[PDB]
Design an enzyme around this catalytic site. Sequence first.
Site, PDB file in Angstrom:
ATOM      1  N   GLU A  35      36.703  27.599  45.706  1.00 35.45           N
ATOM      2  CA  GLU A  35      36.657  28.448  44.494  1.00 35.45           C
ATOM      3  C   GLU A  35      35.733  29.647  44.738  1.00 35.45           C
ATOM      4  O   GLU A  35      36.100  30.767  44.377  1.00 35.45           O
ATOM      5  CB  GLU A  35      36.214  27.645  43.281  1.00 35.45           C
ATOM      6  CG  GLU A  35      37.268  26.679  42.790  1.00 35.45           C
ATOM      7  CD  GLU A  35      38.499  27.286  42.129  1.00 35.45           C
ATOM      8  OE1 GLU A  35      38.524  28.526  41.970  1.00 35.45           O
ATOM      9  OE2 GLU A  35      39.459  26.484  41.864  1.00 35.45           O
ATOM     10  N   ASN A  46      41.595  37.550  36.528  1.00 29.00           N
ATOM     11  CA  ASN A  46      42.936  36.948  36.506  1.00 29.00           C
ATOM     12  C   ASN A  46      43.934  37.942  35.904  1.00 29.00           C
ATOM     13  O   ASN A  46      43.539  38.852  35.167  1.00 29.00           O
ATOM     14  CB  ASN A  46      42.905  35.678  35.685  1.00 29.00           C
ATOM     15  CG  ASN A  46      42.201  34.544  36.388  1.00 29.00           C
ATOM     16  OD1 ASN A  46      41.259  34.723  37.163  1.00 29.00           O
ATOM     17  ND2 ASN A  46      42.621  33.343  36.057  1.00 29.00           N
ATOM     18  N   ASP A  48      45.959  37.626  33.409  1.00 32.78           N
ATOM     19  CA  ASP A  48      46.022  37.608  31.924  1.00 32.78           C
ATOM     20  C   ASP A  48      44.851  38.374  31.311  1.00 32.78           C
ATOM     21  O   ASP A  48      44.765  38.374  30.070  1.00 32.78           O
ATOM     22  CB  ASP A  48      46.115  36.179  31.382  1.00 32.78           C
ATOM     23  CG  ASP A  48      44.893  35.316  31.614  1.00 32.78           C
ATOM     24  OD1 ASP A  48      43.936  35.826  32.243  1.00 32.78           O
ATOM     25  OD2 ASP A  48      44.929  34.157  31.155  1.00 32.78           O
ATOM     26  N   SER A  50      41.630  37.529  31.676  1.00 29.82           N
ATOM     27  CA  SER A  50      40.443  36.666  31.766  1.00 29.82           C
ATOM     28  C   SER A  50      39.781  36.859  33.130  1.00 29.82           C
ATOM     29  O   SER A  50      40.347  37.505  34.037  1.00 29.82           O
ATOM     30  CB  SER A  50      40.811  35.240  31.530  1.00 29.82           C
ATOM     31  OG  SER A  50      41.614  34.761  32.599  1.00 29.82           O
ATOM     32  N   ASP A  52      37.200  34.575  36.047  1.00 31.77           N
ATOM     33  CA  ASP A  52      36.593  33.319  36.516  1.00 31.77           C
ATOM     34  C   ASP A  52      35.184  33.598  37.008  1.00 31.77           C
ATOM     35  O   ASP A  52      34.953  34.588  37.701  1.00 31.77           O
ATOM     36  CB  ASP A  52      37.413  32.753  37.665  1.00 31.77           C
ATOM     37  CG  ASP A  52      38.804  32.291  37.317  1.00 31.77           C
ATOM     38  OD1 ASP A  52      39.037  31.913  36.152  1.00 31.77           O
ATOM     39  OD2 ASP A  52      39.634  32.305  38.237  1.00 31.77           O
ATOM     40  N   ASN A  59      36.859  29.822  33.700  1.00 35.34           N
ATOM     41  CA  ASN A  59      37.603  30.938  33.104  1.00 35.34           C
ATOM     42  C   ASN A  59      37.148  31.301  31.688  1.00 35.34           C
ATOM     43  O   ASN A  59      36.916  30.429  30.846  1.00 35.34           O
ATOM     44  CB  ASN A  59      39.089  30.591  33.137  1.00 35.34           C
ATOM     45  CG  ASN A  59      39.971  31.758  32.778  1.00 35.34           C
ATOM     46  OD1 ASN A  59      40.422  31.848  31.637  1.00 35.34           O
ATOM     47  ND2 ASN A  59      40.184  32.660  33.728  1.00 35.34           N
TER      48      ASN A  59
END
Length: 129
Positions: A35, A46, A48, A50, A52, A59
């Site tokens: 990650e 991301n 959309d 959002s 992380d 998120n």
Amino acid sequence: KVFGRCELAAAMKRHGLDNYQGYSLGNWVCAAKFESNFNTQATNRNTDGSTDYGILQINSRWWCNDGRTPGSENLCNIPCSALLSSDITASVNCAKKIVSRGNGMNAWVAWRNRCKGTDVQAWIRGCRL
Ligand SMILES: [Cl-]
Ligand SMILES: [Cl-]
Ligand SMILES: [Cl-]
Ligand SMILES: [Cl-]
Ligand code: NA
């Protein structure tokens, strides 16, 4: 902060992630490797809108508030910047809520795709824990 592998293992164990929801410590270390590369300051946007955050790339749509993810829930009740601290407490507390939700560690796509079903105990080999 960029953690060493055994350093992160020790911190995650101390914070009660070893065997949390049945996931052994090596699962959590492997997830963090892929990650964030063990870097608490990691961020990734991301598609959309959002983002992380932190060692486990949590998120902003569901879990933390970053002030720019419209319709966001803040189910961990933290600012997303708390997830970038050198102190992993907030990331661990939030990860415990995420992994309890019903799909377990499959919530972390890097865990599904690069850790699940592999020899995850290799990630804690050599560590004094
Ligand atoms: Cl280390
Ligand atoms: Cl490593
Ligand atoms: Cl393990
Ligand atoms: Cl810590
Ligand atoms: Na949010």
